[PDB]
Amino acid sequence: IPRFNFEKFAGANDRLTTQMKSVGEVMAIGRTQQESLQKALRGLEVGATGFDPKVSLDDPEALTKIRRELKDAGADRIWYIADAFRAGLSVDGVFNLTNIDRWFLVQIEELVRLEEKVAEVGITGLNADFLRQLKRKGFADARLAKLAGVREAEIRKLRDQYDLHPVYKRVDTCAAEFATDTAYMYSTYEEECEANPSTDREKIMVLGGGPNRIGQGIEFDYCCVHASLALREDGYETIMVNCNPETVSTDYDTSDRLYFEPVTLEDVLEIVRIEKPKGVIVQYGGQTPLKLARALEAAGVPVIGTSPDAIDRAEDRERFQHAVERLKLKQPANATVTAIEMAVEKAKEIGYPLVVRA
């Protein structure tokens, strides 16, 4: 799935054509198209957890927006297709507007319907059997939590409860006709697990930053690659977790074990669960893994290097200032505002020109 960055180019035409405009891409692997597609959406780093809705069901105007979005694709078309099904449009109807093969469309439709059931039955209706089937279709714990009105962590504890964890299969070029010694894996909700982690090594996991986008490019991947190379060379068993198909980091040669997975708390925790690494590196893949730090650490993950706390101190506008205050260093005049009339007054204090950071 391509990764776009229209929001940075406010005045740009944003409909998709023959001249490319995307800035990156994510890739996913799954035992079925449904599983694969869902994994890709949630690894796209656009805040999605699957087919999160774009328009409201009780918008009298929604069908018009949906229509437009289907007819003249933008970067969000994929999401509007599921809004279309939620809104009562048929597969034939969506077909006519988008020209996307029905083979694909019925699958998305099928997923919308399962989501309806989830919303309807709620957490209580999330019995082991339905939960398995959902997971097997690629549903993220976060999307499920959403539809059931709970915290992602509740869906996760529940799987834990029913001992419902994915298994890992390996890429081998040959559909299992020949054995492999390479560890290039992907998660799936199947029977047999091919991970067979070592019990022998001190492991270090490196977290990539998913697709490339403006401000989060190749520079982050180079860092992750170097951590892998360096520690492997020093003797650690290196584990790379990433899903950007364009980089060196997802080249099986780069690390001892590669998990070609969405860099999300859910996917990472399933991995940490079987790998039991000695340390996890979150500071190299850019924003993506950085925003997972607190949650990873809360879950028991052994994060190494600068603590999530320290990172937040720097990143916390207010926290930082104290530190600067504390270190008796110089920072420019600044204040928090809420209101405009507030702003005007403060600005008055601070002085112009001003940096206005939302």
Partner 1 sequence: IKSALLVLEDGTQFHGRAIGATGSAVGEVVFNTSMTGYQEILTDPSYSRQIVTLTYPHIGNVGTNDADEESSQVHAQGLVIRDLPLIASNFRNTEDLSSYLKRHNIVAIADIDTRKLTRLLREKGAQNGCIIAGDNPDAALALEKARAFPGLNGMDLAKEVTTAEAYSWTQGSWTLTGGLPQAKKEDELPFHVVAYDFGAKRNILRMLVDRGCRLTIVPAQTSAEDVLKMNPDGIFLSNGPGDPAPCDYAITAIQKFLETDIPVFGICLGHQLLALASGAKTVKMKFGHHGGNHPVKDVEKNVVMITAQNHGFAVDEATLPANLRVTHKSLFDGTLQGIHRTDKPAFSFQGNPEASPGPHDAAPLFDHFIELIEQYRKT
Mark the binding-site residues, compressed into ranges: 357
Residue with tokens 């977790």: 241
The residues that bridge with 241 in the sheet, in sequence order, are: 207, 259
Contact segment (CB under 8 A) with partner 1 among 150-158, 168-176, 255-263, 336-344 equals: 168-176
Smallest distance from the beta carbon of 58 to its own copies, in angstroms?
A: 10
Smallest distance from the beta carbon of 57 to partner 1, in angstroms?
A: 24
Tokens at 103, concatenated? 């083979």
Q: Which of 16, 87, 195, 343 binds its own copies (CB under 8 A)?
A: 87
Residue placing its CB nearer to its own copies in the complex, 64 or 196: 64
Alpha carbon distances (Å) from 32 to 41, 139, 211 = 15, 12, 22
Pairing, β 167-170 against β 184-188: antiparallel
- The 92-131 site mask, x for binding Cl ion (CB under 5 A), equals --------------------------------------x-
State in Å, rounded, how far the first CA of the chain is from the last one: 29
Q: Which does 163 bind (CB under 5 to 8 A by kind): its own copies, partner 1, Cl ion, none?
A: none
191 CB-near residues (< 8 Å, 6+ apart)? 167
Of 63-82, binders to its own copies (CB under 8 A) are: 63-64, 66-68
Residue placing its CB nearer to its own copies in the complex, 70 or 258: 70
145 CB-near residues (< 8 Å, 6+ apart)? 151, 152, 153, 154, 155
Residue placing its CB nearer to its own copies in the complex, 63 or 193: 63
- What burial class does residue 216 get, using C-beta atoms within 10 Å of its C-beta: 0-12 exposed, 13-18 middle, 19+ buried? buried
Contact segment (CB under 8 A) with its own copies among 91-99, 184-192, 237-245, 288-296 equals: 91-99
- The 95-114 site mask, x for binding its own copies (CB under 8 A), equals -xx-----------------
Determine the Cα angle at 24 with ends 19 and 25, to 5°. 105
Of 18-57, binders to partner 1 (CB under 8 A) are: 31-33
Residue placing its CB nearer to partner 1 in the complex, 31 or 54: 31
Neighbours of 145 (CB within 10 A): 20
Smallest distance from the beta carbon of 23 to Cl ion, in angstroms?
A: 14
Alpha carbon distances (Å) from 77 to 65, 82, 110 = 11, 9, 17
Of 85-114, binders to partner 1 (CB under 8 A) are: 101-103, 106-107, 110
Binding site for Cl ion (CB under 5 A): 12-13, 130, 191
Binding site for its own copies (CB under 8 A): 60-64, 66-68, 87-90, 92-94, 96-97
